[model samples]
Target: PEFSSFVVRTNTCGELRSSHLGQEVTLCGWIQYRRQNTFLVLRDFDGLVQVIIPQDESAASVKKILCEAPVESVVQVSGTVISRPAGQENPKMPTGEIEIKVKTAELLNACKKLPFEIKNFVKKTEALRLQYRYLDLRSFQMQYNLRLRSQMVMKMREYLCNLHGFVDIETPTLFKRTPGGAKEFLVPSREPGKFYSLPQSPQQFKQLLMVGGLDRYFQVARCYRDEGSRPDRQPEFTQIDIEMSFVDQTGIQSLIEGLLQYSWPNDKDPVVVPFPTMTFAEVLATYGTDKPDTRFGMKIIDISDVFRNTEIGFLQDALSKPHGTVKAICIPEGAKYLKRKDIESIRNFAADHFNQEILPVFLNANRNWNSPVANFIMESQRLELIRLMETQEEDVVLLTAGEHNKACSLLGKLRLECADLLETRGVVLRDPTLFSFLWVVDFPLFLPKEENPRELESAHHPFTAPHPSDIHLLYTEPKKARSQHYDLVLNGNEIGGGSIRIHNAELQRYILATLLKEDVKMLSHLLQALDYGAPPHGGIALGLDRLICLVTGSPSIRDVIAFPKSFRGHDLMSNTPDSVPPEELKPYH
Candidate 1:
């Protein structure tokens, strides 16, 4: 039955049943498929059902019109609900026990030649699907994804607004240029000398709201950035932005944990409350990444001691370097499943990604190694290495010697690569929908700039506060100072990040103008606002798109978005980012 009276139809395709038998009904939906010009399968957002045009003389023209309409065309039918013959019902369908015997029918709209069929079993390329997105959205999976996202967001709004005393306030999108983080999208003003930058997030305005004494605030903020596309990134995205004044890190953390616990999808396993916390240093040491996927264990382990007395020149020389360190990961039953070329490819990946070399040692079942460099070590040292690594027969150990951080990172990446291979080969299994939430804190306040290592830049952002114990290091040894920032990691992705802000105008200015060496004219408004009066404030912005992608077990964020840009950043459906006439740009120029 339909929910709204305004619609022409009295019922949907999927809702009819045996109880409605002998009753007249009007149904509207797309023609899923037709059989022998008399029977048709109809589909709507709810589900599907079978409709039959009777062979009686009165329905001859109606059958011809229905049969002539192609699949995917819109149609309306007035029919009598009749029970299917004994043993003819489909147990899998809710409406299978009954059929629609059409008394009258009308083809509402004719469908032209289809580029692709809308079937669950049909496979289509992403580019083609994006080009014809409207047709693609007709699939049941897309409809489910979007509807689920709607329900999920609604739950979030309820939790934040009703349960928590938070104000739902909106911030402006046309913002002044504040250039320090990700590249921002700019809009040209009619005046020649002015421009507006789309807000990357409501970062500054939310903070100003704190200073303005709106103690608690939240928004479903729209953000934009001028950046290359990735599996998790888009030019425009939504953020669950929240801010509070006079709140500490723990307060915000608890609120978020509860918010997620309350709004999590009903079908999913409950998110464990009070997620585990890890320091940045500990995260790097154990997992070699700030965002660690803890679902499986092939942890990166330091094995520099194994090579301490090596006879091989490379291993010995690498250990002698000031920053050189050795690390290894032991894959379970790797020797049995991984081939030589797979090992070679892992080595190749190391070289390609970091310009480093790795040694992959495969241990045969007889307690002997099968690697070119394995024999160089004495039996005692080899035994010691095996003992340290807990090496087993049919297990493979991959070792690399390089800069300490590089070795850890290389092995970390290799761990994931090997896991992928193992899973594909049916050696390891994991539930993709499982959630692993972690809080990574104690990040460095300043980092050596990638472009010029001699110069420094904010690790999280210039607005983040330095840890109280490390505040003195801001002037003495700024690079070693840690910030009060924290990152919320979900399964291996950084889903959100926030920090206790530097609400002190003096400290904020010094960090921006003195340490990072950036002009402070543009941010003078925020500084002046802080100078007037500000509270100890903090908050976080969660990537709503990415969160939904994970919640829905989608491979990419684009699956959850209604109309996403292509990998090349073009709107394929509407052919956006197209050419415009010079006259339209004349006034702006």
Candidate 2:
């Protein structure tokens, strides 16, 4: 009748087994499922274990009382652990091999009716699922994702602390507003007309730690960014931030590669050793994106030279502009399968979604440029385009011409999307077990923002060290100066990015001044720390959430997070992002 009377109040349902058979055990967990004959199931954070109640007598009374509570209701049951009968074995459940034959059941917390069934995988709408996120998290998929995230965090920390000489440290969450690349979510200051921006990353502080003589340091850092949402982007995220003193680009890469090699499960295929490296220019030329999906080969090809002497107005105009070029991806075996309607749809999709002016030129393998504007181009030029694309008889070439960067980026995205569509249509077969890791290196230290053509922004961060040869070009050709930055890309997504940091005080200040358009006084603390024997250092930050999503094949990062906000950054469960009361706002005055 009472919880205290039960033996062994287990912390988890997973701990129960046949080893504890015939012994009375007390289980405290949420009700997972029930059968009409009055059989019940209980589960805790560890896993689920079955609990049976008789159909009549005192057990029937207990069942009648507990059955009124819905699934997900918290309950305590004292029962003997026993092997299930042959036909009743639940092979699907972890604890199915054995079950608990209950002597008594006590309802700890009863649930009101739920809006939707948590047990069924009926594919609920995103809005409905997010609205009932608490209930949604009870689903098996969410539970597994959460557990996997926890395991990954522990494994990463263990690898860093035990194998690498790294110390885990905590940095300030509530701090002065500073730019770390992405937009910041500002917290209004109690003092009028000022605000404290939430950290976009622990970028500056972690570097300051390196200067403070912490030879190697790491943090499971929480970050926030107030930016427009993408399917993969989130307002709040977690990153495994690391920094080390007296290290170069190779040192950073080696350390991370070693960790990945050591900690990932042995059951999975071995990740390739000495991961392949690519330069920024190479990645742009071949894949069109810094983060290129290396799992498949729908690589973009240069066709600007082939079209240079052509009379196509769009191609001619693009070539006339500075840094303008044309690029295309040869879709293998696409010519035989991709219809005119599909190619046109893809072209429209690119223009509408990516805001590119030049429609993708669809060229057939028969050396013909097939489009509404194809009639304008001469036969010789059309042959040149096909030859430039190096297209095969069964290959379909998709093309775009405009400003070099814009055109390349647009085509790069379409290439990935087309790969997905092709895979779905069984045209392309991908190996899910393969972890294609690549290091995209030698990135430009800074680039001009599209909006402010004259002003420069750090492609990585201001603290990144520029290449020694390009130091002079910092002032002469700032856009062309490459940094010692590297990105760790898996499959197609950028899992991590790092750079050799500027250890010299003057260079650091100069970079900050150039990029921020102001004095480096805001980083005075860091400068002061750097003055006291700061070692030449560099490090990388990996998005743990994204990495887990990649590992588990989750559709979005939200699937891995226990409580995630909607795309618009609204917390549907708590109804957050609500207007503050006047009393709460008064503190800012």
Candidate 3:
């Protein structure tokens, strides 16, 4: 039978049938697996199906070629679909009961040996895997992540356009750099010493569209940030950028929540239409971080009140400072599993990773401290600490006191790490399928950068609107002003964030002037655009790469990205971050 005449081979392995038993069919795909004897498996985008070769065939050339073909080599096969003979059925597989009996095979592309095996789930170090990303992508888990990402993007577009009446817009990739906390990746301009920056987000341009009267807009935007890499961050990443006019913070939140509820697969529990919201202060006090992992609870408890009358100088000093706060984490049943060495190790881990000068305070049921703080504790204060922690025989308490944010963040980090350890030790139930989504809202408009305490910068973005009531405070107390910014956090990861924009021309100008502290000539165009009928507007940018990782249960964002850069921002496969020749760069200079 001709390839075209074979009913298009059904397009998927899962759709193959026993109804076509003894009927000829054609299949094309890369080899996914090979079984002992004369059986092989083929896989396409849809699924995998088995192919059988006769052991007695005297065709030496064909057998030799089949045996020599490497995994991932693309091939075309013509065969008859048939039921597996008695005792050959694989009940666990989708197409296990049926397979193709190959009559002929043709190699389309040859594949070389892979740097790492895709069939095994053995953990490979990140550096080695990124070096051969192409081979790494061949792993089944990676394939699912990439496909899920594509589906997610499509679903988002559909939800925004078909359901919400939003227009998908393309914004400029190259624009002038705006001052902010994160460093920008600058492209040297043709005129020496001048540069263009890859947008950190479509912040200004999307707001400009609202000024142009495009009431609703969205883009699967590419954003670049020059920052140190971590497991959750990349130098370049995708965002589901959106902007809308005539909307408040609540309106934007409702739209985003509805979109998520609509896009979530029916097989899973439907996402709640309105995700739970938390204020910045509430999150910090309750969970120790803005992006709280609400799925599990190991909430931080404040012990500053108990220590207020303490003779311990550090506790007294911390409590006296305006920025200092004491926090604790109650590790349920932790005393039973955690040894002295284990507690010490955790103390060291927090100190090393968080740059805290003092080791964390660990308290047990006996009220004896397990850290250096033991020497500083008075008899009465020690009992007070134990009572504040609600100490039980099996419980362990971890404590820290420092600058409020740092102390809270240190405990927050330890909380997640400790949860993972507890689950591994079988102390807590693990629910991998549960999706806990939270909205962290009411973020402060400005945060003081440590080195420049005199000047303030927007915590999310400069364009974000301050709370109407706090607009006056913008001039007098920039740090105290709250913004209409919000973040969507899932399982401790910030999947998306946005803010209502400063649409009023005067208000926009005031914010810009306050942030820059100098008249910036380049902002004139934006200012002029905002002057002409800009409506109240706001939008969000969700991280597609991170979402895909979460959805597919992948360990890292690198698994989903096709060509991810290393921790140091080097592309190992292409050897990027290399020096450019002076002659090639001369034209730009």
Candidate 4:
């Protein structure tokens, strides 16, 4: 059976070249323009084609029909390709020098007026766009983003398939709940009391694949999570998950380097291979964040020595506590553009997120402090602070005084907020197109600030192995243990992360039981499998949707996704999560 009775398209609208002049061609697309008694434009997924209607006895009716059709209506035209007279050529269009003169026309389908314009992007409400997503996707930038996303996925799979000796494999969709990872969506099963969990990741399956000796595995995986309205998260997402047996962190990292170098979103946007490495400790000491943006230099500095023996109430009180330190971030020319309300808002953000207070000091043109705590501190101390912070005349110095972790953590979030405020006020010019890459390695195995350090929670996971040197420390001084974990960060977002898995059965069992305190009964099969000889393996999962979202510079992950759920995971398009029939819900003995 034929798909449609309308004439088949001979070529894309944009592909009409000079060689086809005076030759007949068939084009099928949406109506983009109208100039009654003269011409109209056609647009398809590829590009636009200009079709002309010359004034003549037989052409009058065709020209009127073409111009009178509703915009966005689907129409098919069989026309003779003709060169535009020299002065009439549109240099801006690919097919501008040539156009088609319609010999036959057919309106396949008429379109209703759009809820919103598709050709031009204007600042509009998001909810409206989501409601009319079918039309919103017609927007040029949206189409480009989706096309780029598709290309990226294909490139990623090709890279893994060749030269790497990797095999594409599928894992079970209905699998055992890998408890203690992200929350997983459950599917109702035929069994009365049992439910099947959707895999949050192919994490367990990929590892078990190693146990099966199918060493090299790759999958463009679909993952589901019942993450109940987590920020920047969706109910469903995609990831490029890879795992290799008999390899350590180094081997997996090298593979990613090749993957990144070959598959960066753009060629000229140099993918800095062997991406500069920074330890978790170094990052905290300097940028104050696990995922830091090194594009701008507002490095956090510690200046407790210069203000030694301070009489000021704030500094003295802060330094009096055990291991308390003061940290400062100096934003160049950040004072004038920042409003009082902005500073207050940052303070509130810090208080809410980190339970810390930040003292925002604005230095005036006279090189004196215009701060709330200006009078309490000595002039000499203030001068030392200015020198230590490397502050410019109009720069703002955000200072936090408390325990080391509290100060650094709050300063991290505050730095990003300040960067946003500066960029907004035209005090700074940042390239949104930059795809900055950074590798954060040697992530601590355990959370540092937990109440009971001995009862440690795995920072990455219990399956993660500690560094060879740190393995002994894991048993003795667990706080000092360092996991062989690494993260790939891009422009302040942690895009993907992984670690070397524990192949030693006893060690894995001890860590699981003692460190993470998971129910051993549920993990009995994995423990038994490791006992039977699990190979040294490691891998990583790059969040495909999140990566595209950041690359497109979209505020929400929903932008890059085709049919994203609402904030509460509601499907605005289908009105999902409909009620199940009562007969299906009845329990049968």
Q: Which candidate should be chosen as best, given lDDT against the real structure?
A: 1
Q: Model 3 over residues 1-589: C-alpha lDDT tens digits?
A: 1223345444455567667677777788778778756778887655578888655456455556666678778887777888988988988777788988777777889887766776564257787777777777766766776767776678878999998899988999988877664657889888888888888888768768888877899988888877655534577888888898888888888888888777775545666657888898889877878888888878788878776676676677788778888778878777767665666667677657766643444455434545556545524555676677776666767777888778777888888778877776556634557788898888998888765785666787877887788478877877888888889999888999888878768877767776674545767787787777778778888888887677667777877787888676778788778898799999787
Whole-model lDDT, candidate 2? 0.76
TM-score of 3: 0.81
What tens digits encode model 2's per-residue C-alpha lDDT throughout 96-140? 878887778777888777777766743758788888887888787
Q: TM-score of every model?
A: 0.88, 0.80, 0.81, 0.87
State the displacement of the C-alpha of residue 391, model 3, in Å, after optimal TM-score superposition.
8.6
Candidate 1 lDDT, 93-173, residue by residue in tens: 899999898989998999888887786724658888878888888887788789888988888899888878888999888
Measured with C-alpha atoms, the lDDT of residue 109 in candidate 3 is: 90
lDDT of 4 by residue, 1-589 (tens): 2322354678778778788888878888888767766778888766788888656779767666676689788888888999988789988888888989888787788887777876674347777888888877877667777987887777777789876778899998898887765677777787777878898788887667889887898998899877655644677889899898989777888888888777777833666768777888888878878889888767878878766776677788888888898888887876667665666777787657857778777654423445657544425466776678877767777888898887887777778888887788566635657767787888888764355555667787768878778368877877588888899888888888888877868887777767544477667778788888888888898988888888777877788988788776777777776787788777521
Report every candidate's CA lDDT.
Answer: 0.81, 0.76, 0.75, 0.77
Error of 3 at 112 (Å): 4.7
For candidate 4, the 10 contiguous residues with the lowest summed lDDT are: 1-10
Q: Residue 494's C-alpha lDDT in candidate 4? A: 84
What is the lDDT, from 0 to 100, of the residue 366 in candidate 3?
37
> Lowest lDDT 10-mer window, candidate 3?
1-10
Backbone clashes for every candidate come to: 0, 0, 0, 0
The C-alpha local distance difference test score for the whole of candidate 4 amounts to 0.77
Candidate 1 residue runs with Cα over 4 Å from true position: 1-6, 17-24, 190-192, 228-233, 268-270, 303-324, 344-366, 369-394, 428-431, 450-454, 515-518
Best-to-worst order by TM-score is 1, 4, 3, 2
